Structure formats: C-alpha cells, structure tokens
C-alpha cells in the first residue's frame, strides 16, 4: 500500500481455474473478483460459481463472451445478490457449450449489493486496489499465448478482448508491475499468473476496471 501489494499472500485468492474451450473469461474474472472481495469482507474464502453466469445469466451471452458489469447487475439484480459455491454448481462448460441453467440444488455462497467501476488510470485503480482488494479489468490478451514468465514490459495493446483478476502490484522492483490471475489452468505462465510492466497502459490494464462490493 504503496511500495508492493500481493493479496495472493494475504490468503485472499483461490487457486487457478480453467476456462477451456468456453469463451467464459467474463465469468471467470467477474466471480475470482467476488470470491476475493467476499473473503475481505470477513468471510471464509469460498470457490464460487462462474458455471451459474454461463448458463444463467441471460445479460450476457456464455460462451460467446461478455462482460463483467453486467455480470455484476444480474447478480444483485437478477439473482437475489447470490453467488452460488463452485461446489454445488461445478463447472459444467469446457467442452465450449454452456448447459442449460438449473434454477435449484445449489448452495449461496456469497452475496455482492452493487459494483464500482474505477478510473481508466493505473495510479488510482493501485490506490483502491491496495485498501479494497482485487479488482477485475478487461485486457488485450493478443500477446498473451506467447507469454512464458518474466515481467512483460512491451504488450500488444489495440484491442481489448480478454477479461482477467489483478491481484497486485509492485512498484519497487526494476520495472514496476501488475499481477495477474488468468484461467488458462496453472500449466500457462507463472504458474497460471502473469507479470506487466505498471505505468504504460500495458495491454490497456486500466481501460474497463471495476470491482464488486460485499455489504
Ligand atoms: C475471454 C473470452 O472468453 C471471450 C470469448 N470474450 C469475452 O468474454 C469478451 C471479454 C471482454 C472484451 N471486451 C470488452 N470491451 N470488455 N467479451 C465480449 O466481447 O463480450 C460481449 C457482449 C457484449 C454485450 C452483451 C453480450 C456479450
């Protein structure tokens, strides 16, 4: 809070996921969002359901993409404020189709009562980011399946079409950087995380930032 920031050592992410086949990013980055905000909030950390925004929510369109704002406003809107636990309704995509959404025999794991949408500039969503938590951003991921570890420094940035988790930052290293949480399994990057240099709009990190709010 300045200086360097990782949430990963304060307990507060889950492991990494695995999207496959589904063009889900949507889901993934709007539920690990949820899953850290929920344990800062005093709570337990819980694996929470990405399954149930694919096949539920109709706001966006599951496999196809979508956004995590409005994945925030069919929650609090559409769902009761519920996130169901990954446990009671595990991920079911992967093969690239969503199944049809089931309504019951799921277990609420966490609630969110609105969303915040930060400012496009890197400075401040490290400012919010340090108190508050781990916020989820839309990114140009272009470079991305090349990326074999080391911090980035130099990214395709003309479109963004990926959305993912920045879990922190560092600003005392050579290169200042962001860390990201991705769902492309453990087996892609650093152990599933990727490193960007902070402070050039690397891969457009701070065009669409936002975060839920527990309470
Ligand atoms: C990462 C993915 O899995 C895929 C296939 N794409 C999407 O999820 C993208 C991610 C966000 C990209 N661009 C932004 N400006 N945020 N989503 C996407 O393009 O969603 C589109 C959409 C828009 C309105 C309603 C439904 C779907």
Redesign the pocket.
Known sequence: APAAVDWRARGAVTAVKD?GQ?????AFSAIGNVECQWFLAGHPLTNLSEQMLVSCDKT??GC????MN?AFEWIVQENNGAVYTEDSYPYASGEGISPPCTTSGHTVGATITGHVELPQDEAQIAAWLAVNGPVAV?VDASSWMTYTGGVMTSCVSEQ????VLLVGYNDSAAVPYWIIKNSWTTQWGEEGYIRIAKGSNQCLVKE?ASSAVVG
């Open positions: 999207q589904c063009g889900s990013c949507w966006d369109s196809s993409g979508g956004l409005n839309a963004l079409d990926h959305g669409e």
